[PDB]
Amino acid sequence: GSRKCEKAGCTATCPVCFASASERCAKNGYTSRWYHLSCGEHFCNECFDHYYRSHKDGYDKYTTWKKIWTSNGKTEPSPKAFMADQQLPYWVQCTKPECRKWRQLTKEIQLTPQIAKTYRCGMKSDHCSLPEDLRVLEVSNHWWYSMLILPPLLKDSVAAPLLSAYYPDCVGMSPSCTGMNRYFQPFYQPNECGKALCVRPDVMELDELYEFPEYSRDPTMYLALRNLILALWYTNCKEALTPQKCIPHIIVRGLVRIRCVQEVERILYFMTRKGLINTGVLSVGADQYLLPKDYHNKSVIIIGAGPAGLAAARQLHNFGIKVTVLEAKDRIGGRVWDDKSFKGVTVGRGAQIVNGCINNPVALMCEQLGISMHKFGERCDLIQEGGRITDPTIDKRMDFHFNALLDVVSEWRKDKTQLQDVPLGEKIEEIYKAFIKESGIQFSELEGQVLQFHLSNLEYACGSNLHQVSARSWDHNEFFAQFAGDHTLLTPGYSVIIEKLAEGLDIQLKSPVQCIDYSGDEVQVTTTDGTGYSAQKVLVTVPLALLQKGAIQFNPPLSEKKMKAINSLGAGIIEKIALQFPYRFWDSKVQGADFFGHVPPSASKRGLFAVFYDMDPQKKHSVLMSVIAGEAVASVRTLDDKQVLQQCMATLRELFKEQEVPDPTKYFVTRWSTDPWIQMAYSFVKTGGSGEAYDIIAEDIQGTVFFAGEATNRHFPQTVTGAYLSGVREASKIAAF
Amino acid sequence: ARTMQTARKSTGGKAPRKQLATKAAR
Amino acid sequence: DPHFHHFLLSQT
Ligand SMILES: Cc1cc2nc3c(=O)[nH]c(=O)nc-3n(C[C@H](O)[C@H](O)[C@H](O)COP(=O)(O)OP(=O)(O)OC[C@H]3O[C@@H](n4cnc5c(N)ncnc54)[C@H](O)[C@@H]3O)c2cc1C
Ligand SMILES: [Zn+2]
Ligand SMILES: [Zn+2]
Ligand SMILES: [Zn+2]
């Protein structure tokens, strides 16, 4: 026999058998062949044969395992795999602060999270004083992993139950193993259509390969640790996820467990910086910062305290980075602004709906806050002035035609460039006329009016009359995976999330920024009253309209490229009206539906209260909300609030013609259009424009000036979610520096 | 954008649906 | 396939 190892380049000058399974085990002596698992782990040819040979006592145990490993995995069941999976002793790190030595557990002991959580040397003299096995240090040599035969496979991963559709060994888990918020679906399932904020359990994302190139050859270990980390975060999103919390949940045999534990911290911090975990409204204070002291030296001025500014500020603050927020208005929130004065209900003057809760940051934050959302039902009757609910067949007939018009638009645009763009509204019109011409079919006036409702609904979505919006690019964002699942009413209002994000941050109100100078060593920021601020980096999150107006003086000036992109998007607008009543007059006719539609008498009036929203899902209080979109936004600019209220009440008395309607006892009418520091509702792509505009606006300048806000998120434009995510995005970029 | 719609969502004009076909799948 | 990528992990 020999004392040398098979593996070329192995530094084991004295192989010893860890298995001792054969009554003939060679121990530290001679054997025909030493089989290598790592630089510190070998088993002799006798113990090899003990399992591998049919006439040996350990053959049963190896064939049974070989069967489970077949009905469960995609990797070949080799004896070395069996060894690493079944016989290799566990290692656990002493938890005594001043020791922290790694210890080998005896071969019969099965390591559990509870054992790892509290382990100290000797747990069955000063056991902590016994020297650490010399093999432990070796593990932190980069070549150590390179001479590992097989990649680690985790046991009982917290991620396991979420991945039952994959081969465990394809996602870093062991084939021989084995009440979450329904909105948490972090992992793509096999054969799934795209959905927002999902990762593949079996493939590294582009940014991941960028940060951890050493895993491009074999991503097994990374995926297992990343998947575990996400599972743990979503299992409990109310606490910071730390390495200490993860380590006990890393269960794998062998010295490799030490390498896994050493990697988890790197991956944790990357996940945190990028905003995948330890995020949302989670708050962390002095001596709880989520990123190492290495990121802390730096400073930032954030301009704007809406969802985007507050997202970035929350992230950076939690990171340990010095942040100051400058807000123009006497309040935070921006286009989030809730009226809490209504009886028993919260009514948003701005945003209040969550579009697609699955994996939505907003859904996460509701979880963290213990907030419940109301899922909208599907029903939305199209009610005519005055009284008549639209015939179901007429309804279906015109829905079909409306969407058929969209199909042909999407067909027309395929070969058109930005230089040939035409307005969506004009395109739809032409296609419609040319269809009635082609086919002698003729629609009634009502059928035409129902079509107008649908058109109005497009205008609400874009915040613009359709003759302004791009036929080519109106729905550009759907090129990317969107947020799936329920649309909900955020009944408590977005303001609760806003408050929570801002709590304890350094925020200066009534401080409108007028000048940003990034020509010197650090950014000089000056307010409209001449007050000076300075920091290493600046993030601007002001609304698109304000960038278009040029209310902030940039030195040096924004690029011509940026200006073209800024002007190629539209500062979309809608206004809201809310009305309180003495009683729920609509219950008889509406029958519990979350909303009801209003068939337009004419094309010109189509955006005047097209949809009415019942603002109490408990059906107890009497508040209606409606919207003003498209052409009707203009028609209302010279009308005072009372006049708008009069037209809304006139509309309601028409919609409910065959009954009486009580007078409203309290109401508001929004004027976002003329709020000086906002001047809009949400962005859209103007004719001639491209989705790429969102990317161009998003582009930092010289890693010194950064941009966020709903109009900088190409994937998720318009929304609080999108604005929030753009802030997380920029916080990651800024923290990397 | 279409994604802003809750009540009475439009459906026409959508690009074909893509479906992840990974090998890691049992 | 750009469609599916995680938004926060494709910022290159
Ligand atoms: C009526 C209405 C309905 C909406 N409906 C929904 C909805 O149902 N669901 C949804 O998701 N979204 C909705 N939105 C859109 C959503 O509110 C916005 O997309 C989101 O608020 C935009 O985020 P933001 O951070 O980018 O910008 P903002 O919210 O716009 O905030 C920007 C901040 O910048 C500040 N600012 C501007 N200029 C300066 C300056 N010079 N100096 C300092 N500060 C400045 C502003 O005061 C503001 O505080 C709605 C919006 C409105 C108005
Ligand atoms: Zn042996
Ligand atoms: Zn060896
Ligand atoms: Zn110890």
TrEMBL record, chain B:
Residue(s) carrying N6,N6-dimethyllysine: 4
Transmembrane segments: none
Location(s) in or outside the cell: Chromosome; Nucleus
Chain spans, region Disordered: 1-26
Domain of life: Eukaryota
Residues with PTM Symmetric dimethylarginine: 2
In-chain residues carrying the UniProt-annotated modification N6,N6,N6-trimethyllysine: 4
Quaternary context: The nucleosome is a histone octamer containing two molecules each of H2A, H2B, H3 and H4 assembled in one H3-H4 heterotetramer and two H2A-H2B heterodimers. The octamer wraps approximately 147 bp of DNA.
Family, as annotated: Belongs to the histone H3 family.
Name under which the protein is recorded: Histone H3
Entire protein: shown range: 2 to 27 of 136
